[PDB]
């Protein structure tokens, strides 16, 4: 056996940093989720870890922009994962 | 382009 902390092994994936808005396109979904899935589908197969994937999401969603309100979106993962989380296919 |  052994012990690990009560709050270990968590992965919280926020679509936006605190105090800000996240975007949803009626015709194709939210910038975050869509990107998440896109990245997931081409990465997981290759054996990439979730943090790596989430980072790519951060990159991608950063290049996106709502021109109208001249705004952007910054995703923000937080984690207590103690191992690499990978989703084999 | 809509906020959540």
């Amino acid at each position: 056996t052994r012990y690990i902390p009560d709050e270990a092994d968590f992965l919280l994936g926020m679509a936006t940093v605190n105090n800000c808005v996240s975007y949803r396109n009626p015709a194709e979904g939210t910038w975050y989720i869509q990107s998440l899935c896109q990245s997931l589908r081409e990465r997981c197969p290759r054996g990439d870890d979730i943090l790596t994937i989430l980072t790519e999401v951060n990159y991608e969603v950063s290049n996106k922009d709502d021109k109208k309100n001249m705004g952007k979106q910054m995703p923000q993962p937080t984690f207590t994962l103690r191992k690499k989380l990978v989703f084999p296919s | 382009d809509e906020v959540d």
Binding site: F10, T16, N18, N19, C20, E28, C37, R41, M74, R82 | -
Partner: protein, 153 residues
Amino acid sequence: LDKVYQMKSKPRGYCLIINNHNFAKAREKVPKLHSIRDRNGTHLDAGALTTTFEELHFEIKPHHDCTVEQIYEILKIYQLMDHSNMDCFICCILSHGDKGIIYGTDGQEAPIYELTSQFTGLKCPSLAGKPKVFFIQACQGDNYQKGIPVETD
């Protein structure tokens, strides 16, 4: 030689999806929300999520237009389930939100902390030492993240 979370399990684990779209009730009951518009498009997220995680061998478990009440209820169930034969647990929440909270389809507030703390080691031993993933797609305020110029990567 890096430690990795085991992920072989027959159904891998459940993957909830609280998908909130119709915020009409919330408009009626909560004044400060006299205008939250319906989340047109969620459907596409839900779909994409389902497909994606389904392909990853997860058992999808959708739920629509849940109120705060209903959300807590749904988590309570999975909190109390026995995940012993599961290697992972995932919960996706698509809805409106504000600083640190998630909005229930009825306008009520749910602190994201209240949601994730439902699956600590004590709260749900069947998941102890297993990845518990939460994807939250919602606003966390009414401010616009401003952009800054830089060089190409």
